[PDB]
Each structure stands twice: as C-alpha cells, then as structure tokens.
Design a protein around this ligand. Structure first.
Ligand SMILES: Cc1[nH]c2ccccc2c1CCNCc1ccc(/C=C/C(=O)NO)cc1
Ligand SMILES: [K+]
Ligand SMILES: [K+]
Ligand SMILES: [Zn+2]
Length: 357
C-alpha cells in the first residue's frame, strides 16, 4: 500500500548558462516537490534515495560514443559547452548536466527496484533533465539519456529478460527516443499520446504517426496516438484511454508500468497548447493503477508551467496513495479530429490486438 517518492535538489544544478529563462528550469522539480509537501503528500510517502546511474547501466540503451561525449562535458569550459550543445537538437549543456542526467536515471532505477521487490507498490520520480527524446546515439529535446527506456531495461536486468513492461508516454510531445529503442521489442510495449499536427509539431517527424506500429517481432507493440486540430483536453485523453490505451494494456498484461509523465499537455502550459486538467491526470493515473497489480512508476518528463506541473503531478501521487479520484466533468463532446485520430489508431492496431474488435 506504500508509495515511494524520489527527489534530489542536486538535479537543479543542470542549467542554461546563456538563457537563464529557458523553459527547462531547475525550479521545475523543486516547485513540484514543494507542492507535494504543501498538500500533505510527501509525508505519506516513503522517501526513496537518489543515486548515480552507472556507465554500465547507460549502455543498456546508449552507445559508448554518446556516453563518453556527454560525460566529457563535465570538465568543459563554457566555450566548449556551447559548441557541444549546438551539435544537438534543442540541447543546452553545463558542467553539472551529465551528473544530473545520471541522478535522474539512477533515481528511477532505485524506484523501479523498490517496486519490484515489494518495498513499495507504486512510486513517483521528480527528476530532471527529461529523457524520452534521447536516442541511442544522441541527445535531443532537453534530453541526454532516456531515463524511462533505461529503467525498463534495468527492471528486466534485476528480474528476467522477458519482463513485460508497459511504457505510457502522456507528455504532449512524441517520445521519439523511446519508440526507436523498443521498436523491434515485444517485451516492452510503448504507448504514446502526443500532439502531432501532421508533423508540424516537435519533434516534427512522421515517426509519430499512427501508422508506425513497430518492426519485426515488435509489430503492434508501438502505439502512436497523434492529435491533429489544436487544443485537446480531458475529453480527448479519457476517450483515448477508454478505447485504446487501457484495452491494449490489459491484453498485453504488463508486470510493470512506467509512465513518461510530461505535464506540457496540461492546462496553462506555454508550449503544449492543450488543456488536460489536474483532475484529468488523476483519472489517467487511476486507470493505469489497475494494471500490473498496481506496480506503477511515474517519471517526470516535460511540463513548463510551474503551477500546472506542480498541481498535476501531485494529483497523480495522490492517486498512487490510494486517494479517491476527484470529480471529472465536461468529457463530452470531443473535438471531431480526436475521434478521427483514435479511429486511425484502432484501424492500425486492430490486426495485433483482439481486444480492439
Ligand atoms: C521552446 C524553447 N524555448 C527556448 C528558449 C531558449 C532556447 C531554446 C528554446 C526552445 C526550444 C526550441 N526548439 C524547438 C523545441 C524543442 C523542444 C521542445 C520541447 C520538447 C519536450 O520537452 N518534450 O518533452 C519544444 C520546442
Ligand atoms: K507522448
Ligand atoms: K515496442
Ligand atoms: Zn514535452
């Protein structure tokens, strides 16, 4: 019945030297942590310690070349930090970046470890920098290493090779890194809900479209739910969970649920442009809690409204603590394009999941 929570203010050291007003702020995790305390949530949680991930552990998903390059930034002058950052898409690097990335990954490892050994049932991870944009061989979208993808591989390493892990990505952006890493894998099911706008939205690749269902023996284990036609919210995401996410999740029957929990699809986020409410995230969380005997780990990704992400992630923790879900309203009607999007995904994954038809 116990809920774990990991947070370490050392992960605030990662910062943008040239634009201190960059959205991926250090206070993102501190504000969220503060909110948990204000709402009597932190006290009801078991504090899981943070730790450094090992280079051995990074190698579960990342090439040795990529690891060494990011690792070397620890001892770089500001000038070389700048040039290294410009070699990636949307990446800023400081001398503490590599360490914070290791702490973020290491924190989720211990959190995953605590769950699988029954030390806790579920857990929240207030970490930064994010990870789902990080590829095997490169950094991208404020991400250095793919925390979620590494946590899945880590979880399998301390249990069994074929441990069925479901990764749900409700960050408003597509987790391009997490998809590519498990694209041929059937042990790790990847489901992502993301604003798409026919490729006109970060990370601007058609890899995020509904027709990308996986490769080889991984066919059907990659579920892209791409939104088109502007602002989406609770009605759309609940409908997506009702008819796609949860039915596919039950058939897959995961033994561990990892949530790439960005909160930029939240109401009030300057980047996402969506309007998912804290009550909405609570119900998303609650639905996922019915899977894998409640073994759920909520990992922070994006989210750039300090009030929105503090209120939203706190709601998720409240649900994990077993609290009653708040009242959800105005779930009807949906934007028409949302129904169309869900219908395209259903059509695409109908051959692989009988629970859809
Ligand atoms: C959004 C933003 N504000 C800035 C301020 C200074 C420097 C770069 C920036 C950027 C990045 C612009 N590149 C495009 C881009 C890249 C990444 C993202 C967010 C992705 C994300 O965090 N997903 O979880 C959004 C837009
Ligand atoms: K996503
Ligand atoms: K997969
Ligand atoms: Zn995002």
């Amino acid at each position: 019945p116990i809920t774990g929570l990991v947070y370490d203010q050392r992960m605030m050291l990662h910062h943008n030297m040239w634009d201190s007003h960059h959205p991926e702020l250090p206070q993102r995790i501190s504000r969220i942590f503060s909110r948990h305390e204000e709402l009597r949530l932190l006290s009801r949680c078991h504090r899981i310690p943070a730790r450094l991930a090992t280079e051995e552990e990074l190698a579960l998903c990342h090439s040795s070349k990529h690891i060494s390059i990011i690792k070397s930034s620890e001892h770089m002058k500001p000038r070389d930090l700048n040039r290294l950052g410009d070699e990636y898409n949307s990446i800023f690097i400081s001398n503490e970046s590599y360490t914070c990335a290791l702490l973020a990954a290491g924190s989720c490892f211990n959190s995953a470890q605590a769950i699988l050994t029954g030390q806790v049932r579920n857990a929240v991870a207030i970490v930064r920098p994010p990870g789902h944009h990080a590829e095997k061989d490169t950094a991208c979208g404020f991400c250095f290493f793919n925390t979620a993808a590494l946590t899945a591989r880590y979880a399998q390493s301390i249990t069994r090779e074929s441990l069925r892990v479901l990764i749900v990505d409700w960050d408003v952006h597509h987790g391009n890194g997490t998809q590519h890493i498990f694209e041929e894998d059937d042990s790790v099911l990847y489901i992502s809900l993301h604003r798409y706008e026919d490729g006109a939205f970060f990370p601007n690749s058609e890899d995020a479209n509904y027709d990308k269902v996986g490769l080889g023996k991984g066919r059907g284990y990659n579920v892209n739910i791409p939104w088109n036609g502007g602002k989406m919210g609770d009605p759309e995401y609940m409908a997506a969970f009702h008819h796609l996410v949860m039915p596919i999740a039950r058939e897959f029957a995961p033994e561990l649920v990892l949530v790439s929990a960005g909160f930029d699809a939240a109401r009030g986020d300057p980047l996402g442009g969506f309007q998912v409410t804290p009550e909405g995230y609570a119900h998303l969380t609650h639905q996922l809690m019915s899977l894998a005997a409640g073994r759920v780990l909520i990992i922070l990704e994006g989210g750039y409204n300090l009030t929105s992400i503090s209120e939203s992630m706190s709601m998720c923790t409240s649900m994990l603590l077993g609290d009653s879900p708040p009242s959800l309203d105005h779930l009807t009607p949906l934007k028409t394009s949302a129904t169309v999007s869900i219908n395209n995904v259903l059509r695409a994954h109908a051959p692989f999941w009988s629970s859809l038809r």
